[PDB]
Amino acid sequence: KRPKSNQDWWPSKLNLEILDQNARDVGPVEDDFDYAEEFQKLDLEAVKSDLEELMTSSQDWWPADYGHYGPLFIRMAWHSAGTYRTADGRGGAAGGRQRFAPINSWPDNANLDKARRLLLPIKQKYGQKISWADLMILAGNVAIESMGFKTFGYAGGREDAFEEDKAVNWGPEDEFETQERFDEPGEIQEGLGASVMGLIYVNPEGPDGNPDPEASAKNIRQTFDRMAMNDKETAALIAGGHTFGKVHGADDPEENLGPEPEAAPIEQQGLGWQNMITSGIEGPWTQSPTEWDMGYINNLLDYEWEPEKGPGGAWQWAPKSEELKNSVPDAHDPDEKQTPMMLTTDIALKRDPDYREVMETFQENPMEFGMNFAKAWYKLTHLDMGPPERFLGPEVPDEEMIWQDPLPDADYDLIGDEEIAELKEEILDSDLSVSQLVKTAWASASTYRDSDKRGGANGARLRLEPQKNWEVNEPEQLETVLGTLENIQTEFNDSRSDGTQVSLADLIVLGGNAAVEQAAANAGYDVEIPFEPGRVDAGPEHTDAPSFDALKPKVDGVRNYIQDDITRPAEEVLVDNADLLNLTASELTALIGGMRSIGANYQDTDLGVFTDEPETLTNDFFVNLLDMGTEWEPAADSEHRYKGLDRDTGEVKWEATRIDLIFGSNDRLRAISEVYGSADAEKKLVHDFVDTWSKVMKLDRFDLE
């Protein structure tokens, strides 16, 4: 057989594999060339022209419905972007991971293997100039446009991934198409973007397979909310999408479709579900499936529907009236007709009071329907690309959307080297301690997540809602620090006579850098942190406060903060968050260990601060953590604390949390700790800590990407 993994023997073992994905860029691409530059060479119009031609160029191995592949490509694009979760920013279309397991084999993505295959010739023709990620969304756009609906815009810039995202927790289920995440509709366990394992959002037949529209609406609303969409956006997306195409269920997929791609014979060459059957549900929603119109909303609202069992054995709805009987041409047989159908999830938009009001308004105002759908489709397919700077191409709208967390332009000259050294001196001479400066700079930068490129120190949103009031940021203390930095900003700006100004965003980072350099100096090391001025201060007007709550940490390793709510072990969350900062196991270890010598804990506790000289960057954390002269045990009447007792005297030496101790427990982390805890490794640790600190401070500076 195959070599059994440590994960099998020890299910609770830390999944450091997720951090290993950050140690290098998998794939054959030159680890130095940037996609942005290659996409800039692309003739977008040419690709769009080829896509337009493809829409009606049917291939025998997968005949186009109604002679137009458009709807199939829209479904492909919707599923690509549809896995996005606001909770961690993972999922989504930014890396084109629909191409890799497990997503490529989810029951919900049945036959999208054929859809992606139809695009291979175009991908090969343009090569590196256009990624699969960008191409899949572009195909969706061209499909919509070719069928009569102009899109709001399009931006390239999604770099292809070469493997699945191992950090994503898709759910607790052990089987696809099953759910163990909700008892009552609308109460799905936190963190998940779907109500069923293997589905994009919800079950098309209804919750738990029961055709209950009212209940379905509850799951639709919650899942879409977790994917950053409100009622109007959700109704607009579902109605706009189902205005096109049909569902396929000529017979039961359970007995007529072969294995999914990952389980299919090698000769299938990446394809799966060898037989048209896809979902098991059969029929079109509208009379003209390849034309943009009000057909879906009209069919849904102007007729009464009844639940029935379709030819594929699945729950679907049919109209009572015989007016719609055989009103749609068959998708392949020119001399046959077909009757429209509705899904339980479509009826949900008509039964649910709030959705119903939106739909009725759309029906009365086709223009509003179009406007809302175009804007929602753009948001759906671009929400994980980050700030406007990352949106590339000639089709990028001039308008910047709030979900792009836009940053204002700097209406002033940037400070130079002399000014920089000047400001660093003044910050250190203030009443702010090294610990306060480090903690504040971390609070500002640590919100960044590479999953959807949100967060970071640029914009100084730390000073705005909701961040300024986050428990972990210690609001009271934070205002004091920001107050002092603001006074320095004011004094600096007022003393200039040449148009130069400094942002609070830059001062926060510069202050952190200065404090780290000082901590290193206290230890006898001369280190200089490279600094790149240019960060600006964003305002409340261009900040969707509620949307930033998804960036609130539940566990912060640097500040040794652990929320009492957490269900997962603290170290598990630590690794999860470390991945969002693109950290490797060694980088995370150097960061935490070095930080404990400085001492930047939440509420200034002594947790993990294994040193007698705080604010002095050394490898004392490792030296003391590894000393066998100390024995550790859980603290009494404590939920997160542990005591380090002198093995002999029995006197308390230190106190710590699982965050600190995992580095001396996990086999791999311990090997790293032993390197840093060696007699002649202090300089190395200091330098590695500094490199990681610098890395994190610059994560959201795409001005050089």
Q: Say how far apart CA 494 and CA 500 lie, in whole Å.
A: 10
Q: How many residues bind ligand HEM (CB under 6 A)?
A: 26
5 binds a copy of itself (CB under 8 A): yes
Give the C-alpha separation, 107 to 178, whole Å.
Answer: 11
- Mapped onto helix, strand or coil, the DSSP state of residue 58 is coil
Reply yes or no on whether 79 is catalytic.
yes
> CB under 5 to 8 A by kind: which of a copy of itself, ligand HEM, ligand [C-]#N, none does 79 bind?
ligand [C-]#N
Establish if 141 lies at the interface with ligand HEM (CB under 6 A): no
Q: What are phi and psi of 16, to 5 degrees?
A: -70, -5
Q: Is 237 in the site for ligand HEM (CB under 6 A)?
A: yes
Q: Which does 65 bind (CB under 5 to 8 A by kind): ligand HEM, a copy of itself, ligand [C-]#N, none?
A: ligand HEM
| 105 touches a copy of itself by CB under 8 A | yes
Q: Does 108 bind ligand DDJ (CB under 6 A)?
A: yes
Residues of this chain, 46-85, that bind a copy of itself according to CB under 8 A: 59-61
Point out which span in 372-380, 552-560, 568-576, 693-701 binds a copy of itself (CB under 8 A).
Answer: 568-576
Distance separating alpha carbons of residues 700 and 314, to the nearest angstrom: 47
For position 254 contacting ligand DDJ by CB under 6 A, the verdict is yes
Rg (CA), the chain: 28
Q: Rounded to the nearest whole angstrom, what is the least distance from the CB of residue 233 to ligand HEM in the complex?
A: 10
The tokens for 150 are: 């102009």
Q: Which residues of this chain interact with ligand [C-]#N, rule CB under 6 A?
A: 75, 78-79
What residues have CB less than 8 Å from 187, skipping those under 6 apart? 222
Q: Could you say which residues in the range 663-702 bind a copy of itself, by CB under 8 A?
A: 664-665, 667-668, 670-672, 674-681, 684, 688
CB 221 within 8 A of CB 227: no
Q: Which is nearer to a copy of itself, 426 or 627 (CB)?
A: 627
**Closer Cβ to ligand HEM, 200 or 502, answer by number:** 200
DSSP per-residue codes, 483-498:
HHHHHHHHHHHHH-SS
Select from ligand HEM, ligand [C-]#N, a copy of itself, none the partner in contact with residue 240, using the beta carbon and a kind-dependent cut-off of 5 to 8 Å. Answer: ligand HEM
Q: How far is the CB of 255 from ligand DDJ (least distance, A)?
A: 8
Query: Taking a C-beta distance cutoff of 8 angstroms, is the pair 621, 675 a contact?
Result: no
Q: Report the partner that residue 81 touches, choosing among ligand DDJ, ligand HEM, ligand [C-]#N, none (CB closer than 5 to 8 A by kind).
A: none
DSSP-assigned states of every residue in 142-188? HHHHHTT---S---B--PPPSS--TT----S-SSTT---S-SSTT-P
Tell me whether strands 305-309 and 555-556 are parallel, antiparallel or unpaired. unpaired
Stretch that binds ligand DDJ, among 127-135, 219-227, 278-286, 398-406 (CB under 6 A): 278-286
Q: In the structure encoding, which two tokens stand for residue 9, read together? A: 């023997």
Instruction: Compute the distance between CA of residue 705 and CA of residue 693 in angstroms, rounded to an integer.
Output: 19
User: For residues 448 and 346, what is the distance between their CA atoms, to the nearest angstrom?
Assistant: 37
Angle, alpha carbons 13-19-21 (nearest 5°)? 120
Could you say which of 22, 55, 64, 65 contacts ligand HEM (CB under 6 A)?
Answer: 65
Tell me which stretch binds ligand DDJ (CB under 6 A): 20-28, 276-284, 334-342, 693-701. 276-284
Other beta carbons within 10 Å of 207 = 26
Total of chain residues touching ligand DDJ, rule CB under 6 A: 13
**Least gap, CB of 245 to ligand HEM (angstroms):** 2
* H or E, element range at 620: helix 620-626
Binding of a copy of itself by 40 (CB under 8 A): no
Q: Which of 79, 248, 382, 640 is catalytic?
A: 79
Q: Which stretch binds a copy of itself (CB under 8 A): 265-273, 282-290, 492-500, 538-546?
A: 265-273
Q: How far is the CB of 390 from a copy of itself (least distance, A)?
A: 22
Question: How far apart are the C-alpha atoms of 18 and 694, rounded to whole Å?
Answer: 22
Task: Looking at residues 341 to 360 of the shown chain, list those that interact with ligand HEM (rule: CB under 6 A).
Answer: 343, 345
Nearer to ligand [C-]#N, 355 or 654 (CB): 355
The one of ligand DDJ, ligand [C-]#N, a copy of itself, none whose footprint includes residue 667, by CB under 5 to 8 A per kind, is: a copy of itself
C-alpha neighbours within 13 Å on the C-beta side of residue 56: 6
Q: Does 204 bind ligand DDJ (CB under 6 A)?
A: yes
Q: Should residue 24 be labelled a site residue for a copy of itself when binding is judged by CB under 8 A? A: yes
Q: Which among ligand [C-]#N, ligand HEM, ligand DDJ, none contacts residue 386 (Cβ within 5 to 8 A by kind)?
A: none
Whose Cβ is closer to ligand [C-]#N: residue 296's or residue 391's?
296
Reported in sequence order, the residue ranges of 221-343 that DSSP labels E, i.e. its strands, are 246-247, 283-284, 305-309, 315-319, 328-329, 337-338
C-alpha span between 108 and 111 (Å, rounded): 9
Pairwise CA distance, residues 285 & 327, whole Å:
11
Which of 72, 110, 227, 690 binds ligand DDJ (CB under 6 A)? It is 110
SS3 for 128?
helix
Using the minimum distance from each CB to ligand DDJ, give the nearer residue, 241 or 455. Answer: 241
Q: Which residues is the chain interrupted after (C–N above 2.5 Å)?
A: 275
Least Cβ distance, residue 462 to ligand [C-]#N (angstroms): 38
* Segment 201 to 230, residues that bind ligand HEM, using CB under 6 A: 201-202, 204, 220
Task: With contacts defined by CB under 6 A, name the span among 105-113, 236-244, 390-398, 602-610 that binds ligand DDJ.
Answer: 105-113
User: Residue 412 binds what, of a copy of itself, ligand HEM, ligand DDJ, none (CB under 5 to 8 Å, by partner type)?
Assistant: none
Smaller CB separation from a copy of itself, 195 or 467: 195
Contacts of 132 (CB under 8 A, 6+ apart): 96, 99, 116, 119, 123, 160
Quick check: 256 binds a copy of itself (CB under 8 A)? no
Tell me whether residue 99 or residue 248 sits nearer to ligand HEM (CB atom): 248
Cα–Cα distance measured from residue 244 to residue 279, given in angstroms and rounded to the nearest whole number: 16
Q: CB within 8 A of 507, min separation 6: which ones?
A: 423, 427, 485, 488, 489
Which tokens sit at 434? 């090294």
Phi, psi (5° rounding) for residue 652? Answer: -65, 125
**242 marked among binding-site residues:** yes
Whether the Cβ atoms of residue 279 and residue 263 lie closer than 8 Å to each other = no
Q: For 101, list phi and psi in degrees, rounded to 5.
A: -65, 150
Six token digits for residue 560:
């040794």
Q: Which stretches of the chain bind ligand DDJ, using CB under 6 A? A: 75, 107-108, 110, 177, 199-200, 204, 253-254, 278-280
Q: Which residues are catalytic?
A: 79
Annotated binding-site residue numbers: 242
Q: Please give the residue ranges that form the binding site for ligand HEM (CB under 6 A).
A: 65, 71-72, 74-75, 78, 201-202, 204, 220, 237-238, 240-242, 244-248, 278-279, 281, 343, 345, 377
